[PDB]
Amino acid sequence: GSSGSSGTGMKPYVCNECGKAFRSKSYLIIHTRTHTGESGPSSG
Ligand SMILES: [Zn+2]
């Protein structure tokens, strides 16, 4: 039991890149990688 959610950052497992909030760090880690979806698709 505790009220604060403080630590070595602003959000818990939220993506500080886009803001995607998750339940566990494992969910944010496997996501933060998806951000690498630029090379593939592109435009002329
Ligand atoms: Zn993200």
**What's at 3, amino acid-wise?**
S
**What's at 39, amino acid-wise?**
S
Elucidation technique: NMR
Q: What domains sit in the chain, N to C, each tagged with a CATH number?
A: 9-44 (3.30.160.60)
The C-alpha atoms of residue 30 and residue 25 are separated, in whole angstroms, by 9
Question: What 3-state DSSP class applies to 9?
Answer: strand
What's the distance, Cα to Cα, between the start and end of the chain in Å?
54
**Is 18 in contact with 3 (CB distance < 8 Å)?**
no
The C-alpha atoms of residue 44 and residue 40 are separated, in whole angstroms, by 13
**Is 40 in contact with 32 (CB distance < 8 Å)?**
no
* CA triple 10-11-17, angle to 5 deg: 95
Residue 7 DSSP label: B
Q: How far is the CA of 36 from the centre of ligand 1 (A)?
A: 10
Q: Which tokens is 20 given?
A: 């995607």
Residue 42 DSSP label: -
Q: How far is the CA of 22 from the centre of ligand 1 (A)?
A: 10
